Paper text:
PYK (EC 2.7.1.40) forms a tetramer that catalyzes transfer of phosphate from phosphoenolpyruvate (PEP) to ADP to form pyruvate and ATP. The catalytic site is located in the cleft between the A and B domains (lid domain), while the C domain harbours a canonical AMP allosteric site. The allosteric site binding for G6P (sugar monophosphate site) is adjacent to the AMP site and lies between the A and C domains.
In MtbPYK, the AMP phospho group is H-bonded to residues Thr374, Gln375, Ser376, Thr379 and AMP-loop residue Gly457, and forms a salt bridge with the side-chain of Arg351 in helix Cα1. The adenine-binding site for AMP is relatively hydrophobic and is composed of residues Phe373, Trp398 and Met425. These residues form stacking interactions with the adenine ring of AMP. AMP binding (purple) triggers nearly maximum Cα4 movement (~6°) but modest Cα1 movement.
Residue numbers in the entry:
A (entry chain D), B (entry chain C), C (entry chain B), D (entry chain A): 2 to 472
The structure:
C-alpha cells in the first residue's frame, strides 16, 4: 500500500453527513483544522468526527490545528463579492466603512502609515494585483493592474513591505488554547519568520499545561533565510506554497520546496508539501497534467506528506481529490520508493542504528522493519531513508500513533509499556500475529533499546522470526 | 540567458497585429501551427508573420506543422455549446444530424460498430466522462457519469477500444503537402503508434520532393510500448500529455514523461514536453503552484523544449504565459543546468568527441563551445549533455538554424560552406567578433571535421583564442 | 598493536633453550611443524615448548602440522652428494640403485613413463636445472643446463608435467595420525590439486576420531585453476610461493597471490602468504629492500597471516626475523588497515550482521567490536573486512582460540558456555574489565545470537557501555 | 610489448665485449653510470658501447650519470681490510692516519663535533653496526654491536644525525663536467635534501654551457619531508631504497616508495624505483619470491621505471636479470596497465588535452595515441595516466628521445621541425607506415599544437586514419 501520507483540510465541503468518515476510508492520514475560517462549534464537531472515524476504521488519523498567524485581510463587501477590473481605482482603508467595489477595509491598521506610492498589493495569493498611487489619510488609493474577482475577507500580501505584527495574535492564542484543550495532536504556525517563534508557541503550551509537536509553515522570505535553524527548532515543516509564491517570486518556489524537503529529511523532521497540488479539482473531477506532475514530483523529492486545501475544504470533489492524490502517489511508489540521498552519513546513535537496521532488513529480505519509539525519533530517522519494506513503529504512548500519521511510510502499534527488550519483542509478535498479513516464521528486523521507557536509549537490533525461539 | 527552448502554439489569440512579433521578442523559439484548427489562409498568414519576426529580430524561430492525425471528434451543436450534466442520457451518432444537447454526430464512423455497453467515452481530454449503455443502430446511447460543458468539434477518446484509422488521413496528407510547400521546418505527427509511421510521412515528403525533420507525438500506449524504436526512427519526440493522460491513466504520465526525455537524450534526439504546463494562464495572469512546479521539473528532467498550447493559441495572456515560462526556466537554470546522467558512455565518434570537447571547455574555463554541423547531429550530441557554457552551432545550411531552435542551449550561426577546417575556424572568429559579447583573446573550444561538407566527418577539437595565431 | 598474524616454522634453529618462548614473546601467532624434516621426538619436544610458552605468556599460539604431500625426490648417492656441472649427462632412474654422479634413483616411479625429451627437471626448486634428452627403459637421460651440488633425497620438480600421485602418501597418513594424536590445532596439505583432496584428509581424521581445520597449500597449476572450489572446500589456504614459482612461471606468482588472497577474503577463509618473505635474514641481521616491500605488500593485499620458513627454522636470526616482520606489518597498519574492497555485498545472515556491526562500531567510535562465535565463522566474516577497531572474539571452545590465531586482527577470549545473550554480554564485561586497557563506561558493539550455543544463530547487535545497565 | 622502463647499471660485469649490446637487445632503456666507482676511461668506453648499441639496434637508450654526492666514507687501513667483531672497541677519527683495526679515519671531518654517545654508525648499509660511547678530541670511540669485515673507503651512515655537507662535492663537480662534456642525457644527484640542491647542479651546467634533466635521488629523511617541493624543482625522482632504508627505518620505505611514485605521477615527472629489486640474482640465475613480488608491485604502484644495480654492474647474471625483470613487468601489464588514480582532475591545458586524448583513443579503439612534444611535457602528462594503447611521442629534438626512455609506455620518433600541424600529421603517417605494425586506414589520435615549434602550444586533438584524406 501507499507509503507517502495525505493531509486534508476540513471545511464546508466536509461537513455534510459521513464525509469525514469517507475521507478516512479513502486514505486521509492527517486532518487539518484551519483556524482562518469557521467557529469553535465547527471545529469541535469536525474534531469529533475525525476521532470517531479513526476509532471506527482503525486507521490512525492525526489532527493538525493550523493557526492563522499575522494574516492581512480585506474586510467585507456589500454583496459579498465584487470584480476589480484592470484600470479601476480602488481604495483600501484602515478606517471603518461598508465595503463596496470602490472602497473596502483592511485588518492591517498600519497599511496607510507604511505604504508608499509604488508598493504592490496582491490579493488572494495573486489573483488580483494593485499598485499604490497615493495615501490620502486612512485610504490607500490603488490602481488595479491585474483584474479579477475579490470577495469578503480575502488575504492580501505586501511583498517587499516589512510587515509589523506579532507571530501569535490574541486570536491565535485563543485558538491555540482551544485546540490544545480540545485535544489536537499537532499545531502549525503560519508566517514563521524566526526559530524563536517556536518559543512563543511553547509559552502558551506550558501555561495551559500541554505540549504537542509544532510545525513551522514556510511562507516568508525570512523563513527561507533561516531555514536550517527553523527546521532544527520546530518539530516539522510545511512548504506553504500559496503564500510563499506571493511573498517570493513564484518562480523561486520549486527549488525552495526541494531544499526544504531535503533539509527536513537530513534532520529527521517531517515535511508536508501544501497548496494547489490538485487545485483544478476544486471544480473539476480530474486534475490537469501539471497537477499530476506536481504530486508525483513532490513524492520524488522525498516529502513525508502532501496536503489538500480547498480541494477538500470547499471544493466539489473532496473524495475524488483524495483518491486521485493517492493513485498518483502509489503509481510513483510502485516504480521506486527511492528518495534523494542524504548528504551526511548518520552520526547519532539512533541514526546509525536505524540506518544499519535498514541495511540488514533489505539484504536479508525481511518482511518488515520494526522500531520501538517513545518520542518518534528512532522511527523518523529510519523513515527518512525510505525503504520498500514496511516500517512498523511500536510505542506505549497513544499520541505517538497520531503524530506518526504524518511520517513517511509508517504505521504505528500501541502496546503496553514494557520492562525489558525481550518483552518488547514478545509484544511485536503478539501484535503482528493478529494481522492477516503476518504469520509465524516471518522474518523481521527489530530495533529497540534499554533502559526501557527511556527516550534515546535505542541500542539493539534483533533479527527475529515471528513466534520462533530465537531471543 | 535562457538555455531551455520554448514552443508556442499560434491561433486566434496570436492573430492580432504584431502579437507574433511580440512572442518572438519575448523568447518563442518554435511556433507550432496546429492543423486541427484554422484555414490554409490562417496558417499562411501566421507562417509569414513568424518569418518576418525572425528576420526582423534576428532570432531563430523554427516553424513546426502539427498534423491532426486520426483524431476522433464530436460534430457541431445547435448553439455551439451545451452542458452534459451527470445523470443525463446522450446519444452519439455516426449518422447525420444537427447536434443538440440530446444527440450529436461523431467523425468516427465505426463508433456504433465497435462500441459495447460498458465502454468509456472521455470528452475534451477527460473534462466530461460517459459510459455506453447500449448501441441502437447508428446511435451510441450513453450516460454522463462526470458532467461538464461540451462544444462543437471537441475530441473524444475511447480508452480500451482498439481504434482503426490510418496514421495519416487524406486531410493530413493535404495539410502536410501544404506545409512542406509553404516552407515549414519540421512536422509533428499526432497519435504515433509504430516506428513505421515515419515511413508514411517520408513517402509524402519524397513524392513532394522535400524532407524536413519528423517529430513523433507520444500520446498512445502503443507509442510508449515502442518508445525506443520510435525515438530511433523519428527525428524528435513530443510528450503530448493531454491525450496521453486520457489514453493512459493520468497517474502514469509523470514517469512516462521522464522515461521519454531520458530516452531522447541518450539518443541525441530533441524532446518537447507539451500541454497544460501553465494551463490556468488561459484565464489567469499568474499560474498555480503546481504549474510552476511542472515547468521547473520538466527542466530538471532534461527536456530540450517546453510547449505552450491554449496558453498562447486561445488564452487571454499569451505574452505573459511565454514570459512566465521563461522566468521559471531561468530560475532553475541559474541554480544549475545539470540533467540526469546518461546511462551509456558515448560510443560514436561524434558522441565521444562532443563529450571530450565539453570536458576540455569546462576544465579550461572556455567562454564557449563551438561545433560545426551539417545535419545538427554533432551539436545535438553535445547539447544533450547540458553545460553551463554557451553552445554555438555553426552551419552552412540555413534550415539547420531553424531546426536547432528546438535543441537545448543552442544558438546557430550561418556561415559559408568552407573547404578546410582552418577556414571553418576563421569563420568562427569573424562571426563571433561581430557580437558585442566576444572579443579577441577569448578562449573557445571548437569542434569540426574533415573532409569538409560531409555529415559525420567530425574529427577534430581545437582550443583557440579568438583572432590569435594558434591554428 | 599488530593486527596481521605471523606464522613461524620450527626447526634446528628454534631447538636451543628458550627460543620457542622468545618467539612467542616476540609475536609468533602460529607455529608450523614441517613434517618434511625431523623425527616424531623432535616434533613432540617442539609442540610441548609451544604449549608451555602459550600458557605461560597468555598469548594464543596455534600449532599447524604441514604434511609433505606427494613430493618427488631423488634417492641416495654413494658419496652422499655430488656436483652436477653444466654440460654433463646424468640419468635419473626409476629403478633402485645407490646413486653416483652419473645415475641416481627417484621416488617417482612413473618418471620414465611420463617424461619426454624437452621436459625440464629442476632440483632443489631451481639451483640445478636439467633437460630430458631421451628415455631408455627405466632411465631418464638428461643434460645439465644449470649446474650445482645435489645430495641425498633432494626434491625435484617437473614443471609442465602432469604428475599422477595420491594426495596423501603413506608417510603423510602416519604423520597426520601422529599430529592429530599429539593435539595440533590445524593441518596443511602440500601440493593440493583438487577440492576432493580435502575428503582424503577428512577420511583419516574420521577414522582417528579428531577433525581440525585443513589448509590447502597452493603450489600447483591445478590448484590455481580450481582456486575457488578449493577455497570453498578447505578451511583456509596458503600461497606456497616456493613451489608455486617453479610449477608456474615465477613471473605469474604475484598476481596469483593477490587473486588467492581476494578469493579467501570473499569467502571468509583465512589466507597465509608463505616463503622467502625475508629470505636474506637466514644469513643477515636486516632484510633486503625487496623483502620489506614484499611483507608490506602482502599486508596491503589483505593477507590474514604471513609466514617465516627457513628464516626461523634454520637461520641465524630467527628472533630478529619475527621482530622485523612485525615492525613492517605494524608500520603499514599504522598508516591504514584498509584492504581491497570485497566485490559483492554480503548475503548471509552472519556476513550481513558482521558488516552492519562494523558500520555501527566505527560510526559511533566504539572501543571494540566483540563477536561471539562457536566455529569462528561470525568473527571471520568481520575480520576479512578489516577495521581499525579491536576485534574481540568470544567463545566457549578453547580450540577456537588457537584456530583464530591465524585470523586477521583477532584476539580471542574463552568464557563459559552461556544460556542467554544477556549472559554472553555479562561475560564480555567480566573478561574486559580484567584488562588494564578497558574500563567501565567504555562503548563496545557486541554481536551475538540465540539460540545460544548454536552455530549460525548470530542474530543480534547490541551497543553496550561496559558495566552499565543498558541491556 | 613492455610499457614500464628498465634502468641498468654498468660496471665490471658489463665490460666484457658485446655485453652492453646484449643488454640493449634484452630491453635496457637507460644505462646508469655510477660515478662512485670506475675511472673516466671506464665510463667513456661504456658510454661509447651504449651509443653504438642504441644506434645499431634502433632502440632509444638514455644515459644517466649518477653523482656520488656527499657520501661519508672510512679512510684507508694499513692492511687494506680488517675484521670488526661484535664486542670490540674501535675509534673513527677525523684526524689523518693510515688505519688499523683499532683506529681509522673518516672523510666527514665534523664527525667528532657532531656525534654523541648513543649514535649509531652503520657501515656498508649495515652489515657492521657500531654505537658511539664517547668523543675524545678527534676520536669517536665506538663499540661494535654487529660484527663483520670492513675495508678501505667503505661508506658509513649516521642515521638520525644531522649531516652538514655541500650538495655537490668537488669530485661531483668534476664528474658532472666530465659527464656533460661526454654527452650524457640526464644526471642523478645522490643524497638530495632540499629543492635548492637543483640550483647548484644548474650552476655547473650553465657554466659548462649544457643542461640536461636532473633526477633527485630520495634517500634522506629531509628529502621525504620536502618531497613535493623536490618533485616540483627537479625533473624526475629516484626512490633510492638502499640508503633510504638505512637513513630511515627500513619498515617505512614501502609506504614512502608509494607516496613518492604517486607524487611524481601527479606532477607528470618520471619516477624510478631502485635497489635490491632482484638482489639475489647477483649470485643466482632466478630471483626469490620476494624479489618477483617487489618488481610486480612497483609496476602496480605506477613507477615509470625500475632499476638494476649490482644485478647488472657486478653480478654473475646481468642479462638474465634484465630478461627476468622484463618478464615480470610484462606479466603484470598483460593483466592490466591500470595505475592508482590521480587525486586531482587535470588543470593545465596540456594535462586537460592529454587526458581528453586518452578518453577519445580508448573509446574509439584507436591503434595508438600520438603526441608531439618539444620538451616531453605533453607526453609525460599522458604517460602518467597509463593506457593500454601505444603511446608514440613525436619530436624534432633527438635528446628528447633519450630523455623519454625513462617515461612510462612511450616510444619516440624523431622527425623534422615542421611549420604546421598538417605537416606534423603527415610526418606521423610517413614514420608509422615504415613500421610493419601500422597500415593505411589505421585509426590514431594525434595531439599537437600551434604555433609550431613552441613549448606548451599543445591545442589540438585530431582523430586520423593513416594515409586518409581526413585533415
Ligand atoms: N628442519 C630442517 N632440517 C634440515 N634442513 C632444512 C630444515 N628446514 C629447511 N631445511 C632446508 O634449508 C633450506 C631453506 O629452508 P626453507 O626456507 O626452504 O624451509 P622449507 O621450505 O619449509 O623446508 P623444505 O623446503 O625442505 O620443506 C632448504 O634447503 C631446506 O631443505
Ligand atoms: N512499549 C514500550 N515499552 C518500553 N519502552 C519503550 C516502548 N516503546 C518505546 N520504548 C522506548 O523508546 C525508546 C526509543 O525512543 P525514541 O528515542 O523516542 O525513539 C526505546 O529505546 C525504548 O526503550
Ligand atoms: N560551414 C561549413 N563548411 C564546411 N563544412 C561544414 C560546415 N558546417 C558543417 N560542416 C561539416 O559538418 C560536419 C558535421 O556534420 P554533422 O555530422 O551533421 O554534425 C563537420 O565535420 C564539417 O565537415
Ligand atoms: N560462550 C558462549 N556461550 C553460548 N553461546 C556461544 C558462546 N560463544 C559462542 N556462542 C554461540 O555461537 C554463535 C556464533 O557461532 P558461529 O556461527 O560459528 O560464529 C552465537 O550465535 C552464539 O550463540
Ligand atoms: N617535429 C615538430 N615540429 C614542430 N613542432 C613540434 C614538433 N614536435 C613537437 N612540436 C611542438 O611541441 C609542442 C608540445 O611541446 P611540449 O609542451 O613541450 O610537450 C607542440 O605544440 C608542437 O608545437
Ligand atoms: O497556508 C498555506 O498552506 C499556504 O499559504 O499555502
Ligand atoms: O497533442 C498534444 O499536444 C496533446 O495531446 O497534449
Ligand atoms: O610449501 C611451501 O611453503 C612453498 O612451496 O612455498
Ligand atoms: O643510491 C641508491 O641507488 C640507493 O641508495 O639505493
Ligand atoms: K492558516
Ligand atoms: K611440507
Ligand atoms: K652514486
Ligand atoms: Mg491557500
Ligand atoms: Mg499561508
Ligand atoms: Mg491539447
Ligand atoms: Mg494530442
Ligand atoms: Mg612447497
Ligand atoms: Mg644511495
Amino acid at each position: 500500500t501507499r507509503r507517502g501520507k495525505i493531509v486534508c483540510t476540513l471545511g464546508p465541503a466536509t461537513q455534510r453527513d459521513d464525509l469525514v468518515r469517507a475521507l478516512v476510508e479513502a486514505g486521509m492520514d492527517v486532518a487539518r483544522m484551519n483556524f482562518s475560517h469557521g467557529d469553535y462549534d465547527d471545529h469541535k464537531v469536525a474534531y469529533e468526527r475525525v476521532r470517531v472515524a479513526s476509532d471506527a476504521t482503525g486507521r490512525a488519523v492525526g489532527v493538525l490545528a493550523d493557526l492563522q498567524g499575522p494574516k492581512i485581510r480585506l474586510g467585507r463587501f456589500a454583496s459579498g463579492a465584487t470584480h476589480w477590473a484592470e484600470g479601476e481605482t480602488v481604495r483600501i482603508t484602515v478606517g471603518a466603512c461598508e465595503g463596496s467595489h470602490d472602497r473596502v477595509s483592511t485588518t492591517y491598521k498600519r497599511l496607510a502609515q507604511d505604504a508608499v506610492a509604488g508598493d504592490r498589493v496582491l490579493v488572494d495569493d495573486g489573483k488580483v494585483a494593485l499598485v499604490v498611487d497615493a495615501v490620502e489619510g486612512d485610504d490607500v488609493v490603488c490602481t488595479v493592474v491585474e483584474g479579477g474577482p475579490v470577495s469578503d475577507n480575502k488575504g492580501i500580501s505586501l511583498p517587499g513591505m516589512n510587515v509589523t505584527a506579532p507571530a501569535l495574535s490574541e486570536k491565535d492564542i485563543e485558538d491555540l488554547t482551544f485546540a490544545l484543550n480540545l485535544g489536537v495532536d499537532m499545531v502549525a504556525l503560519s508566517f514563521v519568520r524566526s526559530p524563536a517563534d517556536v518559543e512563543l508557541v511553547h509559552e502558551v503550551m506550558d501555561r495551559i499545561g500541554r505540549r504537542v509537536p509544532v510545525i513551522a509553515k514556510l511562507e516568508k522570505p525570512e523563513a527561507i533565510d533561516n531555514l536550517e535553524a527553523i527546521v532544527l527548532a520546530f518539530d516539522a515543516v510545511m512548504v506553504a506554497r500559496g503564500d510563499l509564491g506571493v511573498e517570493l517570486p513564484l518562480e523561486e518556489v520549486p527549488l525552495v520546496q526541494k531544499r526544504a524537503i531535503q533539509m527536513a529529511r537530513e534532520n529527521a523532521k517531517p515535511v508536508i508539501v501544501a497548496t494547489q497540488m490538485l487545485d483544478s479539482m476544486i471544480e473539476n473531477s480530474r486534475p490537469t497534467r501539471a497537477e499530476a506532475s506536481d504530486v508525483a514530483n513532490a513524492v520524488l523529492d522525498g516529502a513525508d506528506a502532501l496536503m489538500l486545501s480547498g480541494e477538500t475544504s470547499v471544493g466539489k470533489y473532496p473524495l475524488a481529490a483524495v483518491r486521485t492524490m493517492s493513485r498518483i502517489i502509489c503509481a510513483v511508489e510502485e516504480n521506486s520508493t527511492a528518495a534523494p540521498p542524504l548528504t551526511h552519513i548518520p552520526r547519532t546513535k539512533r541514526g546509525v542504528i536505524s540506518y544499519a537496521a535498514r541495511d540488514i532488513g533489505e539484504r536479508l529480505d525481511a518482511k518488515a522493519l520494526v522500531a520501538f519509539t517513545q518520542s518518534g525519533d528512532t522511527v523518523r530517522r529510519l523513515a527518512r531513508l525510505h525503504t520498500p519494506l514496511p516500517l512498523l513503529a511500536f510505542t506505549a504512548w497513544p499520541e505517538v500513533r497520531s503524530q506518526l500519521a504524518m511520517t513517511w511510510g509508517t504505521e504505528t502499534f500501541i502496546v503496553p509499556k514494557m520492562q525489558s527488550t525481550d518483552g518488547m519483542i514478545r509484544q511485536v509478535d503478539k501484535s503482528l500475529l493478529e494481522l492477516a498479513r503476518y504469520k509465524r516464521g516471518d522474518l523481521v528486523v527489530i530495533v529497540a533499546g534499554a533502559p526501557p521507557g527511556t527516550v534515546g536509549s535505542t541500542n539493539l537490533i534483533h533479527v527475529h522470526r515471528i513466534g520462533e525461539d530465537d531471543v
